[PDB]
Amino acid sequence: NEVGYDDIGGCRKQLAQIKEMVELPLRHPALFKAIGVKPPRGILLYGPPGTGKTLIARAVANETGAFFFLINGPEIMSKLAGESESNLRKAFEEAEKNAPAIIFIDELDAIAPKREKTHGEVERRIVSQLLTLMDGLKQRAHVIVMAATNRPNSIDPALRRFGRFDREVDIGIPDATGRLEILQIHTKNMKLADDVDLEQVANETHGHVGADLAALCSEAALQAIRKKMDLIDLEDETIDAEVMNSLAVTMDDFRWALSQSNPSALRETVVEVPQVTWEDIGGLEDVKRELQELVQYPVEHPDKFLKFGMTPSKGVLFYGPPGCGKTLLAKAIANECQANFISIKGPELLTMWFGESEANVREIFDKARQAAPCVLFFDELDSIAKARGGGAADRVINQILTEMDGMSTKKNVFIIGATNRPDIIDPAILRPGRLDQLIYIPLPDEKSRVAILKANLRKSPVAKDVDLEFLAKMTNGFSGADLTEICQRACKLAIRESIESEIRPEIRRDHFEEAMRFARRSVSDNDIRKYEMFAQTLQQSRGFGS
Amino acid sequence: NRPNRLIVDEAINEDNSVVSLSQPKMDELQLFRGDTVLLKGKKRREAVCIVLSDDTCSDEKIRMNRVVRNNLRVRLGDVISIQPCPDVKYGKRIHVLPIDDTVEGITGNLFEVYLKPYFLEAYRPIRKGDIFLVRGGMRAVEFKVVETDPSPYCIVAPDTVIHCEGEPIKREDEEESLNEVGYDDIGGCRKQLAQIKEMVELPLRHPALFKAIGVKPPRGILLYGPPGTGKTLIARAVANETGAFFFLINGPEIMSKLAGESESNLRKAFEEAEKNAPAIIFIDELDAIAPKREKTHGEVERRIVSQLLTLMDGLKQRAHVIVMAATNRPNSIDPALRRFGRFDREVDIGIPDATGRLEILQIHTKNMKLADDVDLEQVANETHGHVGADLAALCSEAALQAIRKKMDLIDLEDETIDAEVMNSLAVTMDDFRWALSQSNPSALRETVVEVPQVTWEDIGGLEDVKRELQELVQYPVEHPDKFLKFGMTPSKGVLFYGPPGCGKTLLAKAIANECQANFISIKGPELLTMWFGESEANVREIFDKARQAAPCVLFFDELDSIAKARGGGAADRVINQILTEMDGMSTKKNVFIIGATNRPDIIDPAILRPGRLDQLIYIPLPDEKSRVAILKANLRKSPVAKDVDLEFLAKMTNGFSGADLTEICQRACKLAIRESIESEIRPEIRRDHFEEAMRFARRSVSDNDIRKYEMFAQTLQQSRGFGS
Amino acid sequence: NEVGYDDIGGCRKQLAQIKEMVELPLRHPALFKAIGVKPPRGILLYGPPGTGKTLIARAVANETGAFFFLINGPEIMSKLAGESESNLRKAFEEAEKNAPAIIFIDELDAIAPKREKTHGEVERRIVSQLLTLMDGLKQRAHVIVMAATNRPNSIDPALRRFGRFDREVDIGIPDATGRLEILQIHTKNMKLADDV
Ligand SMILES: Nc1ncnc2c1ncn2[C@@H]1O[C@H](COP(=O)(O)OP(=O)(O)OP(O)(O)=S)[C@@H](O)[C@H]1O
Ligand SMILES: Nc1ncnc2c1ncn2[C@@H]1O[C@H](COP(=O)(O)OP(=O)(O)OP(O)(O)=S)[C@@H](O)[C@H]1O
Ligand SMILES: Nc1ncnc2c1ncn2[C@@H]1O[C@H](COP(=O)(O)OP(=O)(O)OP(O)(O)=S)[C@@H](O)[C@H]1O
Ligand SMILES: Nc1ncnc2c1ncn2[C@@H]1O[C@H](COP(=O)(O)OP(=O)(O)OP(O)(O)=S)[C@@H](O)[C@H]1O
Ligand SMILES: Nc1ncnc2c1ncn2[C@@H]1O[C@H](COP(=O)(O)OP(=O)(O)OP(O)(O)=S)[C@@H](O)[C@H]1O
Ligand SMILES: [Cl-]
Ligand SMILES: [Cl-]
Ligand SMILES: [Mg+2]
Ligand SMILES: [Mg+2]
Ligand SMILES: [Mg+2]
Ligand SMILES: [Mg+2]
Ligand SMILES: [Mg+2]
């Protein structure tokens, strides 16, 4: 019942890194003192609450068999002035006594926040006390200190110095795959109904963290118990096992718990591999190739680039009319390259307080490094352009530019930007060394339009009578988003008829013809002319605009 | 599990001697409406009652009042055996004695005021040892049946004599008080009180059961809402109804003590709760102990918050203890407390709606004799922005008024008390009207979250639009299965746009009413009011409340005001944050976002992007036919003369908006009123009034405006590219 | 020479409201203990300086004949830490002893200002101390607490909560008619010339 690596999911890579750092010196200590090389001593685990930081720490302790001394932030800070410092001192002394050992400082920020965030002489003294203890690890009795914090920015930067917490591990939020992994962990002991499909639950539970999932499963069990105990009327103090085994957890028990769920990390920026593939995108074939050359080749074939002696471009800029697949392409190329993906929409950047915005932009680029290979996507840039001509929009973009330059190409981080408005984009972004690969993405031509319709209607039951090639021929000038809306509007008609009169659930030709009568174009002819013009002259915007 | 065994449940019939079953179960046991049934509970106690039918009652459960519950030494969820009692015959003499703490203030004939009307024409079946409650004279006294001539039980027929002679008996140790708080003292928040009951009933009622399963129970529940909404009330109720030990921790009280004492008292509270588990620790005014870390400057203060956090973590012992806490400001609490393992469950006990306020008013008029002219529904409707405590106070105030004017007589009797007269005290509707004028409502500034009372009937024309709204909002709620088969996810939000005063706000509320779904309105100006720095947490708080109230329709009205304010660094941050919140809003949550603007020419294109407010619904001036419908709607409540022709009125007002017509009705109504005053007549609104009002009538939407609105109706989706 | 309602002018309506709130529980206490309905506990008088807030309190005490225990904000806050908290305790303890009684807290904002304006650990303890005492009035010992402050916004909002100072009375600036009434009060003992 004790915690182990088998109780942890959704962060394989991170859990691996920690194993490397800790396993050798903790399992083979005598070997390390003879080796003479200095190992890690301070490991900082960080991530939103409930990601399993405390869980991981304890797991590593049990699995390595090292002595585990836990230091809970709040408990330390609940003691008298001198007492907090003293308790810290003992913790380290006790660990050295029982080396090899792991000291785990939970909720580190409770003890050592930013120097400016501290109010009180006594508080500042405790931080220093901790800093000194970390330096005292020069004793090399070899105790490893792990620490957990929700917010890396809250921690006193002095702690991130060499000799202290010089190693960091980002235990971010789990992706679809991870959440599924976790769900399996907390459904180990429960009799699961056959209709249950955890993969759906995993996909559905976006913004969910480990603790949330553990709870969602817990609540799903209570639903099955409540409704099934009502009847049993057992009241017994001790319960019979045979009844518990006959107790199954239906897919409804999960859907009910799903609606009642308060996901915590929904506001958090997600870092995962997109589930969007080339197949979800119609047309733009030649662009997909160019994206593989720009993103995949430098990852899969670094040796080749070295022989020709060129450094590959850092970033790309998608530009064209709205609703043509710019967002789709960004996610798609990441999927092909099995590379992490981080989306940052314009509005997301303009939400940050003026002052706070600066540290957040850095944190984004930091996460991009952590997740290398990674494609960092700045979407909806047009929102930011409009907001400048705003001192906030200025500070953000100017810092993004600074970050781009600091980004070494060898880090395998690819930056893509997207905008529907190349006329108001900051020329600075288009400078060689930044987003200098200008890819124009126009309205879909006839052949392309057919592909889009095919993709969107895959999930839906379409009648055989429906001619999609003819639909494509009549919708010249319509964007990709326009076509999806026609399908949706046509589907609303098919659904409407299905409700009133229980009829074969399929969408037929007549629905599309009706949807077409009210269909409207999102991109006028005048817009096209302009987009076509910028397609040949966007690179000329760095001088005197026309 | 023989049929006689049944589960205890809440009561609907306020009558003490009444228990209810479902017809199918009443037939199963072979009992009927008139029958007198014998109830056997725990602790070898019994109670006798009249049985009744209840269509809502589930066959596995039995509804019984809290009085009956206590006589059986039973609580909600327990099991009891019921068996028929034809052996009950009329009584000769009955002897009941009052309980000291409920009668020490009153003197006189307790039997004529309370027992008389209580048993009159009632033929109540009672039992020896039973405790019943009689409310009257602004007081509730409980008597205990000491003896009955046909013991141990008999019916109280007119021939039965009563003797209530004797100093009130003292309270037995095991006899819990009915003056104590219970679920029946709470109204206006059924849904919330249900959620809490689910969370708490299992671990508190069946502790051994939870320890065997190994699944984690709740430990920290945080109740929040404005002051006086009944947060402290709910905590006490849940404790009593579950029979758990209740230890109250008052924030201010702890923070009034020395450093060492505060730390100490918190410890003892937890130690005491664990000692008497199962138990509920209630931390009242939590923000007093643990406010936002930035505002907690001071060493002694920082230590106590940490002290509490540690104690909360110490609950890992799993000593059947639940920690409930209340705070007016959820944002004020140190976020460390909202983390998992501590207060990981939250319940928003907001302000009561009309229906709720009525429920509450009924609670505090239990013991008062209400005159016939009293109409609590009016008072409820009238007391908008009132909170539980406000309503509770005004009822006390309306009563105190009835006493003042009736005190003329009492004074000469002051020496002693006039119990017989206390019953003669009625509370007129005037006493409420007086208290209404003197009321200081607290939650007027609070954002209201309730079901709108605006229906399709209040909206003229726009028939096809109403249709499209049902498809967008209702279908995905009522028919989720269908959407899954077609493999389409329904749109997230809508945008109303058109000339001013055509029913954009009305439609938003109407669709909410049709779906009986909660509704939250936030007008542009409201968003521009929030302090600049504060704006960030407030926008989020809105969407949080929308999630809490799912299914819910979130309506951003008067968007044009914000547009004008941007082209304003404040207006920018807000809308950009709303866009962010929209995206984070999962369509599967059944939260529908609607926006409205009179100015599609300056609306932020970002709002119109697919995935946000991508359903662009145009709402034009009403055509001839619609104008007639609107005119009827406004004049429904008013006394109109037969001569007034609305078909012609509509014909003359081509180009007028919905609001314009309403203004015409008002102006025409004002003329009729004027004439009623000058010349004393019952007013009627006739042709002459409309003609006079029409001569001065003016149109709010010009021809130039119409041309423009019609153009945007065809090109609003094109604004995401280059401007026109 | 002691103060009475006849020494007060320019606020008929307000003085009437206070009389209503106070008359029942203070004059006929036994009835209120028996009836079970809740009387007012905290009445907060507010208005610019010198409007007669302190005057009204004294008058209401005399006309009702209740025991009057005055708590001066500045006086309590001028004492050492322990004495300040202790003096508050004493005030409530004696008032409960001599019920019916009126505790008048003059210059309330001196003791309990907005939490944000309350720099200092010891100062907040006193505010909490007061809040508890007000809650301790749950004894329903025929005791009413009246308080005066120049700035209603300055008072800790916790005090305006139900069960504490749940009733407020605005004693604004007197109008022309009011000012005349006042003038007559302070010219009672003077021989006034005819030209006046
Ligand atoms: N990756 C995970 N795998 C399995 N269970 C998890 C995982 N993450 C969280 N949980 C569950 O959530 C519970 C609490 O997680 P924690 O270990 O407390 O993470 P945490 O980040 O330390 O929480 P905070 O920040 O102190 S609120 C665990 O006991 C698990 O049941
Ligand atoms: N080439 C395409 N293939 C399939 N679907 C498309 C395509 N282009 C656009 N869409 C649809 O339009 C939606 C959004 O398109 P995006 O990928 O976001 O391109 P975009 O340039 O960012 O357009 P906007 O401004 O976000 S609407 C997708 O969800 C698709 O349904
Ligand atoms: N929902 C309700 N139903 C019935 N009575 C209520 C309700 N809410 C409040 N009351 C009454 O008003 C009084 C105030 O209730 P409280 O328990 O004090 O609520 P509260 O939120 O804890 O007050 P605060 O926050 O401490 S000011 C109670 O004594 C009730 O009599
Ligand atoms: N279709 C209608 N049916 C009945 N009354 C209407 C109608 N349209 C407008 N009104 C009247 O106009 C008032 C406000 O209408 P709204 O619902 O606010 O429409 P709107 O589009 O939001 O225009 P404004 O800017 O708020 S006046 C209502 O109080 C009605 O009296
Ligand atoms: N309404 C009034 N009627 C008669 N005399 C008044 C009135 N108002 C003020 N006065 C006189 O002016 C003096 C004002 O003193 P106070 O009663 O203390 O007023 P106050 O508002 O409490 O003063 P502050 O705010 O503490 S400086 C009184 O002593 C009276 O003599
Ligand atoms: Cl830009
Ligand atoms: Cl806008
Ligand atoms: Mg933790
Ligand atoms: Mg996009
Ligand atoms: Mg309370
Ligand atoms: Mg409106
Ligand atoms: Mg004064």
Side-chain angles (χ1 to χ4, degrees), chain B residues 104-105 138-139 227-228 250 252-253 255-258 285 297 300-301 328 389-390 392-393 396-397 400 403-404 407 411 414 422 434 442, chain C residues 17 20 23-24 27-28 30-39 115 119-121 124-125 128-129 131-132 135 157 161-162 164 167-168:
Chain B
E104 40 66 353
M138 302 179 61
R139 253 251 211 182
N250 185 258
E253 177 157 21
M255 300 299 280
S256 69
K257 310 267 170 196
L258 291 166
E285 305 186 51
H297 39 8
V300 181
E301 305 191 15
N328 316 131
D390 291 319
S396 272
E397 196 62 21
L400 274 165
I403 295 172
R404 259 186 294 273
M407 192 222 314
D411 209 330
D414 207 9
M422 273 309 275
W434 177 81
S442 51
Chain C
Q17 293 181 15
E20 288 189 334
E23 184 170 351
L24 289 173
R27 295 302 308 169
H28 306 73
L31 174 61
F32 236 102
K33 153 274 189 65
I35 192 166
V37 161
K38 70 199 152 181
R115 255 81 118 92
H119 316 153
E121 182 215 338
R124 295 168 194 140
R125 231 203 304 154
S128 293
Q129 172 65 302
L131 288 171
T132 303
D135 296 343
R161 253 147 203 72
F162 304 96
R164 295 157 181 174
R167 299 273 244 282
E168 299 174 23

Side-chain angles (χ1 to χ4, degrees), chain B residues 430-696:
Chain B
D430 278 7
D431 288 322
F432 278 63
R433 270 173 200 122
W434 177 81
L436 267 172
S437 61
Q438 278 268 332
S439 67
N440 282 346
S442 51
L444 308 94
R445 228 79 74 171
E446 292 292 340
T447 67
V448 192
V449 183
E450 62 186 22
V451 190
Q453 288 174 339
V454 183
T455 71
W456 297 125
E457 297 182 344
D458 302 340
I459 304 177
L462 304 166
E463 297 298 342
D464 55 355
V465 173
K466 299 181 187 184
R467 210 137 115 273
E468 187 177 17
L469 285 171
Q470 292 190 249
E471 295 181 5
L472 290 166
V473 182
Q474 199 171 10
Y475 283 5
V477 173
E478 282 184 351
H479 306 305
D481 52 2
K482 298 268 173 176
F483 279 94
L484 285 162
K485 290 227 189 119
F486 282 89
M488 71 165 284
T489 29
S491 61
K492 185 175 299 185
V494 182
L495 180 75
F496 293 142
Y497 67 102
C502 294
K504 290 181 283 294
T505 301
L506 288 169
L507 285 168
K509 300 184 187 171
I511 184 58
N513 176 275
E514 179 65 19
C515 302
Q516 285 299 303
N518 289 291
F519 177 83
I520 305 180
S521 170
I522 296 185
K523 285 158 280 193
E526 293 183 47
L527 291 174
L528 304 173
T529 296
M530 300 169 182
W531 259 355
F532 306 152
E534 302 298 343
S535 299
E536 104 76 34
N538 293 26
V539 174
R540 278 158 64 182
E541 184 178 353
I542 293 161
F543 281 85
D544 286 13
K545 283 177 176 177
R547 286 186 184 89
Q548 298 294 298
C552 178
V553 22
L554 180 63
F555 181 49
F556 291 99
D557 204 353
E558 302 182 23
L559 286 175
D560 61 312
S561 287
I562 307 179
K564 284 165 164 280
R566 295 177 70 183
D572 293 329
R573 232 203 331 280
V574 168
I575 282 188
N576 282 295
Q577 182 163 5
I578 287 176
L579 292 170
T580 292
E581 288 296 324
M582 286 195 224
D583 295 6
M585 197 78 264
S586 179
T587 183
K588 285 245 186 64
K589 244 290 175 178
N590 268 331
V591 174
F592 236 93
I593 300 168
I594 296 102
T597 185
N598 303 311
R599 307 242 356 218
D601 61 324
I602 60 173
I603 189 170
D604 188 345
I607 305 171
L608 313 183
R609 179 186 67 73
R612 302 181 176 148
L613 307 193
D614 54 9
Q615 298 307 311
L616 316 183
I617 303 180
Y618 173 58
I619 296 168
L621 294 169
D623 59 353
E624 215 189 327
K625 310 198 115 176
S626 299
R627 291 196 295 278
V628 175
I630 296 172
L631 294 161
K632 270 200 175 89
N634 302 153
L635 300 172
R636 293 179 303 189
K637 322 131 193 177
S638 304
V640 188
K642 169 187 188 180
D643 59 11
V644 180
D645 188 89
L646 284 62
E647 284 72 9
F648 173 73
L649 201 68
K651 245 198 175 63
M652 299 295 96
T653 58
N654 186 85
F656 285 64
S657 76
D660 290 337
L661 295 176
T662 307
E663 182 61 19
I664 293 169
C665 291
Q666 289 240 327
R667 183 162 206 79
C669 185
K670 276 177 181 114
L671 293 175
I673 292 168
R674 138 144 316 193
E675 183 167 3
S676 181
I677 301 158
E678 282 156 2
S679 53
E680 336 310 16
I681 323 138
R682 163 174 257 93
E684 303 183 350
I685 176 172
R686 46 166 183 294
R687 279 162 99 116
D688 311 359
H689 293 149
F690 279 97
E691 275 174 338
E692 231 292 339
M694 192 58 58
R695 196 161 89 88
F696 293 167

Side-chain angles (χ1 to χ4, degrees), chain A residues 174-443:
Chain A
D175 58 30
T177 322
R179 293 193 295 274
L180 169 80
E181 267 185 25
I182 302 163
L183 286 160
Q184 292 170 200
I185 303 219
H186 295 92
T187 56
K188 280 174 169 176
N189 291 8
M190 320 195 316
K191 174 63 173 179
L192 285 180
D194 208 333
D195 63 350
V196 180
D197 181 22
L198 296 185
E199 196 188 353
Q200 279 146 29
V201 177
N203 274 288
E204 272 238 20
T205 54
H206 175 273
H208 277 259
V209 151
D212 291 320
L213 299 175
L216 156 70
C217 292
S218 233
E219 198 62 21
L222 271 44
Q223 184 63 14
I225 294 172
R226 255 181 319 230
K227 77 155 294 172
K228 299 298 175 177
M229 220 219 82
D230 194 5
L231 325 172
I232 304 164
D233 178 7
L234 61 140
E235 155 279 352
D236 296 337
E237 169 176 80
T238 156
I239 270 41
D240 173 303
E242 270 215 342
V243 182
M244 296 271 48
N245 197 119
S246 65
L247 213 193
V249 186
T250 65
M251 180 65 178
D252 277 355
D253 291 322
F254 276 60
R255 271 177 201 126
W256 177 81
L258 265 171
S259 61
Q260 280 271 333
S261 67
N262 282 346
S264 51
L266 173 84
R267 229 80 74 172
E268 290 292 342
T269 68
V270 192
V271 184
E272 64 184 22
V273 192
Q275 287 174 339
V276 182
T277 72
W278 298 125
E279 296 181 310
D280 302 340
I281 304 177
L284 303 166
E285 296 298 343
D286 55 358
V287 174
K288 299 181 187 183
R289 304 186 332 229
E290 186 177 17
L291 285 171
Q292 291 190 9
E293 296 180 6
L294 290 166
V295 183
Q296 198 172 10
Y297 283 5
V299 175
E300 248 76 348
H301 306 288
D303 52 3
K304 297 266 173 175
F305 280 94
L306 280 164
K307 291 228 189 119
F308 283 86
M310 73 183 284
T311 28
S313 61
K314 184 175 299 185
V316 183
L317 180 74
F318 292 144
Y319 66 102
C324 294
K326 288 184 283 293
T327 299
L328 288 170
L329 286 169
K331 300 183 187 170
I333 183 57
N335 176 275
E336 178 64 19
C337 302
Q338 63 173 63
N340 292 97
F341 178 83
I342 303 181
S343 171
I344 300 290
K345 285 161 280 192
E348 292 183 75
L349 292 174
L350 303 174
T351 296
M352 300 168 182
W353 266 2
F354 303 154
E356 301 188 277
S357 59
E358 105 77 33
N360 292 25
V361 174
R362 280 161 68 184
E363 185 177 353
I364 291 163
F365 280 91
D366 285 14
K367 281 178 175 177
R369 286 185 184 88
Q370 298 295 299
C374 177
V375 26
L376 181 62
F377 181 49
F378 291 97
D379 204 353
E380 302 181 23
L381 287 177
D382 59 271
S383 287
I384 306 179
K386 284 166 165 281
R388 297 176 72 183
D394 292 329
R395 197 201 325 278
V396 169
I397 282 188
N398 281 317
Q399 182 162 4
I400 287 176
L401 292 170
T402 293
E403 286 296 325
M404 286 195 225
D405 296 8
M407 197 78 265
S408 64
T409 182
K410 190 158 269 68
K411 252 288 83 176
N412 268 332
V413 175
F414 300 86
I415 300 169
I416 300 146
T419 185
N420 301 312
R421 307 244 359 218
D423 62 324
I424 59 174
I425 191 170
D426 188 345
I429 304 171
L430 312 184
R431 179 186 68 74
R434 301 181 175 148
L435 308 194
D436 54 9
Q437 298 306 311
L438 316 183
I439 302 180
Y440 171 58
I441 296 168
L443 295 169

Side-chain angles (χ1 to χ4, degrees), chain A residues 68-84:
Chain A
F68 189 75
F69 197 113
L70 169 87
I71 299 175
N72 184 257
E75 177 157 21
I76 275 288
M77 301 300 279
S78 67
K79 313 271 173 74
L80 288 165
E83 221 185 336
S84 324

Side-chain angles (χ1 to χ4, degrees), chain C residues 63-83:
Chain C
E63 233 80 59
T64 59
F67 171 65
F68 188 77
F69 199 115
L70 170 89
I71 298 175
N72 184 258
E75 177 157 20
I76 269 194
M77 300 299 280
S78 68
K79 309 237 172 181
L80 284 164
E83 225 183 336

Side-chain angles (χ1 to χ4, degrees), chain B residues 57-96:
Chain B
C57 180
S58 118
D59 340 2
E60 294 122 3
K61 304 183 176 183
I62 175 175
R63 302 190 184 278
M64 59 173 62
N65 207 259
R66 216 223 291 178
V67 183
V68 179
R69 238 181 265 154
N70 271 18
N71 289 332
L72 295 172
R73 301 289 180 278
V74 180
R75 308 187 183 281
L76 292 304
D78 276 337
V79 252
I80 60 92
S81 58
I82 179 173
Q83 54 176 62
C85 240
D87 301 331
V88 197
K89 302 292 181 59
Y90 291 9
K92 309 281 202 195
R93 42 177 146 124
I94 289 175
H95 196 53
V96 301

